[PDB]
Amino acid sequence: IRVFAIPPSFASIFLTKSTKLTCLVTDLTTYDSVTISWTRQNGEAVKTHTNISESHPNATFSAVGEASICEDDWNSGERFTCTVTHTDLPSPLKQTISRPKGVALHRPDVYLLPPAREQLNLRESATITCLVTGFSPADVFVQWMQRGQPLSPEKYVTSAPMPEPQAPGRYFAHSILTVSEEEWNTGETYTCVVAHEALPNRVTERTVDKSTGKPTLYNVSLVM
Amino acid sequence: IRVFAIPPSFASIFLTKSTKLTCLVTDLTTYDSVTISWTRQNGEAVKTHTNISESHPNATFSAVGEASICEDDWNSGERFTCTVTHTDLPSPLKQTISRPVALHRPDVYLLPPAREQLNLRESATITCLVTGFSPADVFVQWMQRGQPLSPEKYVTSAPMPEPQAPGRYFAHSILTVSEEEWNTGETYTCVVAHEALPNRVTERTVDKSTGKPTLYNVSLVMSDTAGTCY
Amino acid sequence: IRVFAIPPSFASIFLTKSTKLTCLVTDLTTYDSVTISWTRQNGEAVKTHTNISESHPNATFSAVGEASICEDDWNSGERFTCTVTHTDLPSPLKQTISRPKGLHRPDVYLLPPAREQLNLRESATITCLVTGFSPADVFVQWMQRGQPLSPEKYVTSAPMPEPQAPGRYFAHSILTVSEEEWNTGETYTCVVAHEALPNRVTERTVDKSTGKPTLYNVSLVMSDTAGTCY
Ligand SMILES: *[C@@H]1O[C@H](CO)[C@@H](O)[C@H](O)[C@H]1NC(C)=O
């Protein structure tokens, strides 16, 4: 008799440029032929839903209802409801879900930290992280692109959001990039883009090179 | 009715300098005569539980318990079971917790702040990158010339598993400090204690003198009439 | 008729992480049918020992016995008594050994090698100086990269009180390294252990050029019109 719903975060909408509504109903009795539907605040009908998940091997039934709409409807303020109806249910339960509004809105600050000098001494690998702090809300999406070509999602893992101790309403995140030491010698800019709902373009990247953190080495002056 | 028993994490052992295991009962009604105890592999005298809770906001009753054991009798494979004889359950509830993997020495690296970060002259962040270690639950803290900092100042991160390495983990630890408190000192040695090192505890420190790789310059002067004494 | 006893040194509880008490039985006649064991002031069960020593050819009784205990029992205040009964001396000989019941943090000052040693192009000596710590009997070890070196590579000097401060001590520990291995760019950190630091473990690392950037100011003059000055 447990009902849950995962709201569509900004990190998932930015992937396919389209929001998706999902509902997770677990801790129920294993039975088939379960009707899952979505109802709006005004009762307007929703689009066709399919791709219903099966039951878990541990005697747990899970039903997922997919519904794709535009970002304007989700940002307008309309509230949805994951209605679950079945024979064993004495009454059709309801659960509302929407986008919480009324929080802070600060533009993210990207600080691409250069790799440490001692890391390159081993000549084994090199982990370049992208420090992003001072943003609201949390759960932002970051990735890496190789001269415009995105890399595989497996290489980079987004750190879990966590509130900043020195800030009342800001968060921070990390995104490492494990690459070989010999690779970061002929370019490898590794632009760190950030997805947030405060920037005018919602995307901000930084361009670096091998001689980024190293200051000038020559100061030769000519006197004539 | 579920009973949990959180094993003593390595982070709490080093900080408190004393091991302490907790085994409490949950999902129980508001009944009295609820006693708890500790049973070892063979069964001997244990420490009496103290600091009993009162109640919970969700209309339930619980009783936590702590004991005092040694550190050598934990990594040898010994098990500790907290047997609770509930009044409403004819069968006593027993929870056995113990410890068993590969061991890799952690790698400690300190990342200096970026050049563009100091241009704002608002705050400075120092990250001590720790990667390639096993198992998880590693405690990372910061100090200042031998004086430890308050736990509210520095906050560690979660032990996210390394994607490239199938059996390693990486952690992060930020330290937001003022911009003016960086060019006059504040080494902020990154002290980290792990259970896969010959010396257990290791620490590394960085400062502003780590850079400037012999920034030399040669004055090229020719066909000039200065009339001075070099 | 005197039974010696070796107190648990701080240098022995860190290298092996196992504090064990041992009382040396000497100055007695060599005979069989003897009872050697350990007793505690509390009055609980005490583990026995093994590895009985041989017989001294100079007609001197010798016996060694060690038992494995925990680490918090010695620091709590519990006393351990080693009583040995001999046929010639029926009177028991009680040997109560306990740490004194009553402190400054050590300072690691890694002295860089001089230039005269490198001029001979034979070897290089790196010493680690630690001053201002109490009490004595500390442990100094050397580690390379991520593993310790051989025990014979470095020898730790005996503790000696500071002639200036009556409540401070100092220790010395040198290390032999070739010139080629010194200019490679290694660390050769000095990690010690003390019973007063918040983490009890500290280490300091250096490099070939870690003190100052050592910038240059050389000027190249190729003008034949600018005269010189005496
Ligand atoms: C060389 O650099 C130093 C420090 O950067 C500076 O003081 C000196 O004036 C420079 N030499 C010349 C000829 O400008």
Ligand SMILES: *[C@@H]1O[C@H](CO)[C@@H](O)[C@H](O)[C@H]1NC(C)=O
């Ligand atoms: C080198 O610099 C020092 C101080 O910067 C100065 O005293 C000295 O005269 C300089 N050498 C020459 C040859 O001018």
Ligand SMILES: *[C@@H]1O[C@H](CO)[C@@H](O)[C@H](O)[C@H]1NC(C)=O
């Ligand atoms: C030494 O550095 C000073 C700047 O501090 C500069 O004025 C002088 O010309 C330098 N001496 C040389 C280049 O011989």
